[PDB]
Structures are given as C-alpha cells and as structure tokens.
Design a protein around this ligand. Structure first.
Ligand SMILES: Cc1cnc(Nc2cc(F)c(C3CCN(C)CC3)c(F)c2)nc1Nc1ccc(F)c(N2CCCS2(=O)=O)c1
Length: 289
C-alpha cells in the first residue's frame, strides 16, 4: 500500500525489542500534504524476526478498537525484504512519558479513565485469544488527554486452540519485573499473566512514574541491590512465592491497591478477569465523580 520512496523520515521515536519506530511523513504528492505516520522496522532482518514481524503485522491488522493503535499498512522494497509496518502516529508519546510530564494535572479520576481504557483494550484482545505479554506504561500510547491505546504487539502470541496458556522462551532480556511468577518459572503466558502485568501497570500509573518508585527499583531494593546477573531472577522468584509485593504508592486509595494485589495472586485461576477489572474501576470512577 505504501511505497517507500514517499516515506519521508522525520525522526526516530524509539528503539525496542528487535524493532525501531520512526516518525515519518507519507507524502506521495511531494507537496507537504501527506500525513504523519509511525513506521516500525526491524533492526536486523533475520528470518525468525521477519516471520515474527509478519505475525505481529497480521495480529495488528486483525484488531480494530478505540484503545488499540491503528494499523495503516505495510511497505516493502526489493521484493518484500525490509518490510515496514505503517501505523497511525499518536502525538503525545508513551503513557509513561506523558504521565511523567503532566503529573500535576492528572488526578486519580483521570488515571482510572486510562485504566478502564486499558482494560477494555485487553478484554478485546482476550476475545481473540491474543496474549499481549508486554503490558507496561512505556508500551501504552497517548492519543490525546482523554484517550490512550495499547501500542506494541511484537511479543503478542495467539493461544493454542486446546490450551489457555502459551509457553514461550525467547532469546533476549525480559521485563521480569512485570512478569507473573508462572511466566518467570515455567515460561507460561496467559490472559491471567496479562492480568498480573496489568496490576503492575496500575501500580505504575499511581506512582506517577517517580524514579525510585518504579517496579525495577522497588523489587531490586526489596531483594537487595547486591543481586547481580541471572541470580537476580532467582531471588525475585522467592520474593513472589513468599508474597512479597510492590508497596502501595503514595496517595493511592486502599480500593485501588486492593485491585492491584488481587491481580498479583500467585494462584493463576484466582486472578480477576479484565471485564471484572473494568467493572470495578468504572464503579470506583463513578463514586469519585
Ligand atoms: C505506533 C506509534 C504511534 N505514535 C507514536 N508517537 C510517539 C510520539 C512521541 F513524541 C514519542 C517520543 C516521546 C519521548 N521522546 C523521547 C521523543 C518522542 C514517541 F516515542 C512516540 N508512537 C508509536 N509507537 C512507538 C513509539 C516509540 C517506541 F519506542 C515504540 N516501541 C517499538 C520499540 C519499543 S516500543 O515497543 O515502545 C513504539
């Protein structure tokens, strides 16, 4: 759909797990009438990454929801190598940076608005049996002050038809401080591990991304900063099996922290569903208004 000769580079937006994203202008008339778009590409176009990137593209194309970043197309040159994914451009960047920069205008009601939008997006993913696997505020984007969207599907897996978990071990470093215990121990990913990660996202939101209060800082302080290398993971595992948890963020109401701790159940089957999470969050939001 998009021809790369018209994809005009404006800046690099971010560099992630085997991918990078650039802000470009698609200007096929070359008269500065084209629209600004986001362009995702691989930084090493090997074949596992190309096939996984094709899976990611197909997954994003199959999703249409107010709280999921919009797929716009693909662009290739030289016979389908250098595949690029074209997406809508969201002008406010990640929810992590946005929250860090506007923490004194964003009150609790607004945090719960974002929360409820994230839960609706995640429930829509669950209806397609997609497991996102990388839920974090750095991965949620801000369209405007009233709308956020889940935004990076590079790790998203489709559940097998006969099971409710997906076992995956990738080469790479892993956002272990967002991982459910069964994901750390058995590499099992499910809707319930996405619910654990969502609990961590709720924590993040209510810390307003204060630097010492991030999940990596809190967990490294809890287990001890002398842990170093693979051994860190080991200690984290013990911390979670002895019911060590991230603390209640400053100013967080007890109801919200209880939602968080209910999402951090060691028992996979006792974690709430995203529909219930949305219902509780919406009722709290209505109580506050
Ligand atoms: C699809 C999409 C649409 N619009 C936008 N708008 C956007 C607007 C911005 F002002 C910024 C920043 C704000 C902060 N300073 C540094 C400069 C500009 C920005 F970073 C993004 N971004 C999108 N995606 C995206 C962006 C950035 C990413 F790192 C990743 N990721 C793929 C590798 C890891 S990642 O999965 O996080 C996806």
């Amino acid at each position: 759909q998009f021809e790369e000769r018209h994809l005009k580079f404006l800046q690099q937006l971010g560099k992630g797990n085997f991918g990078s994203v650039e802000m470009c202008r698609y200007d096929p008339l070359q008269d500065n009438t084209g629209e600004v778009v986001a362009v995702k590409k691989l930084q090493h176009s090997t074949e596992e990454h190309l096939r996984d990137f094709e899976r990611e593209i197909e997954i994003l194309k199959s999703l249409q929801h107010d709280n999921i970043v919009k797929y716009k197309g693909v662009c290739y040159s030289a016979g389908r190598r250098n595949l690029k994914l074209i997406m809508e451009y969201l002008p406010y960047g990640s929810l992590r940076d946005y929250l860090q920069k506007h923490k004194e205008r964003i009150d609790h009601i607004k945090l719960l608005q974002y929360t409820s939008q994230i839960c609706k997006g995640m429930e829509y993913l669950g209806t397609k049996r997609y497991i996102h696997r990388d839920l974090a505020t750095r991965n949620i984007l801000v369209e405007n002050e009233n709308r956020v969207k889940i935004g990076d599907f590079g790790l998203t897996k489709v559940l097998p038809q006969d099971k409710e978990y997906y076992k995956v071990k990738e080469p790479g470093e892993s956002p272990i401080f967002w991982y459910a215990p069964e994901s750390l121990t058995e590499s099992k990913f499910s809707v319930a591990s996405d619910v654990w990660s969502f609990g961590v996202v709720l924590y993040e939101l209510f810390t307003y991304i204060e630097k010492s209060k991030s999940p990596p800082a809190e967990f490294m302080r809890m287990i001890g900063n002398d842990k170093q290398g693979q051994m860190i993971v080991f200690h984290l595992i013990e911390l979670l099996k002895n019911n060590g948890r991230l603390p209640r963020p400053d100013g967080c109401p007890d109801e919200i922290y209880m939602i968080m701790t209910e999402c951090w159940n060691n028992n996979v089957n006792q974690r709430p569903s995203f529909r219930d999470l949305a219902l509780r969050v919406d009722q709290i939001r209505d109580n506050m208004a």
